Design a protein around this ligand. Structure first.
Ligand SMILES: [Zn+2]
Ligand SMILES: [Zn+2]
Ligand SMILES: [Zn+2]
Ligand SMILES: [Zn+2]
Ligand SMILES: [Zn+2]
Lengths: 162, 162
């Protein structure tokens, strides 16, 4: 079901963010970017969607690198407002899927959402992580990504990538 | 078409906001709440959706009063973040349609969006009017309001209310 995949994306993305942030803390120690909002967000580690988001953060660690690097350098130029965040999110997310959908691109979108959320927090926009989550959920619903995931077996199919 | 009604809501709401703000300036003069974002937003006065949003602002002027009054007093308690704005928007918008959809409630939702946008601007959240617009558009799509309007003839049917 496309709609149920779309509903599950919130928990997948929240779990992805938590574990990606924890992994960056483990890799960088005191040099990691601080964002307490990514430590305290709602989390259910044993749920299926919590397990999916975590596994995608893990497998993403050795595939995101070039795309993750350019996200950071580009975000240094992101203007401060919620409208600027939406416009930049939409441009980048659309470009990721211009040539079709695949799991690597899904993971790239989650990673982009993580980097966007981190950037806006570091530049003084607090309480915006739920809004980035909604950007991701709604984009995946209206851009047929939830439909593509549903035809692959749902988010649980992502566990096969590990 | 439900999807095309949903697409048109952006322009309807932007036009509603522009003309509601202009009307409040005309009724209150220098006592009106200032919000330059509601003067400079994209506007196409002669388009059908621009005409619809304007007419709904006009007819709304003598039906919103009690609901508009409580919106203002309640919004004095709205916490500052984008997440707080989304949570409050969703609670109020859901309550407006709990017992079904009618044009008066559609106009009340547009008026609520106007008051929410004005409040968040007055309290230091700039560049958020597009986000309130998206709250309205997406709520009307996912809560079957766009579908209800489509079965009534589309947004153009609102011109019959005048
Ligand atoms: Zn890092
Ligand atoms: Zn730059
Ligand atoms: Zn949507
Ligand atoms: Zn007034
Ligand atoms: Zn209060």
């Amino acid at each position: 079901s496309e709609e149920q995949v779309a509903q599950d994306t919130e928990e997948v993305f929240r779990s992805y963010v938590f574990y990606r942030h924890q992994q960056e803390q483990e890799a960088e120690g005191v040099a990691a970017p601080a964002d307490p909002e990514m430590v305290t967000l709602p989390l259910q580690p044993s749920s299926t969607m919590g397990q999916v988001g975590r596994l995608l953060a893990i497998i993403g660690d050795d595939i995101n690198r070039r795309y993750d690097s350019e996200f950071q350098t580009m975000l240094q130029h992101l203007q401060p407002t919620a409208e600027n965040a939406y416009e930049y999110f939409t441009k980048i997310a659309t470009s990721l899927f211009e040539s079709g959908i695949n799991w690597g691109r899904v993971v790239a979108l989650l990673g982009f959402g993580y980097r966007l959320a981190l950037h806006v927090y570091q530049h003084g926009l607090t309480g915006f992580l739920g809004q980035v989550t909604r950007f991701v959920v709604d984009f995946m619903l209206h851009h047929s990504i939830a439909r593509w995931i549903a035809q692959r077996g749902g988010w649980v199919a992502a566990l096969n990538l590990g």
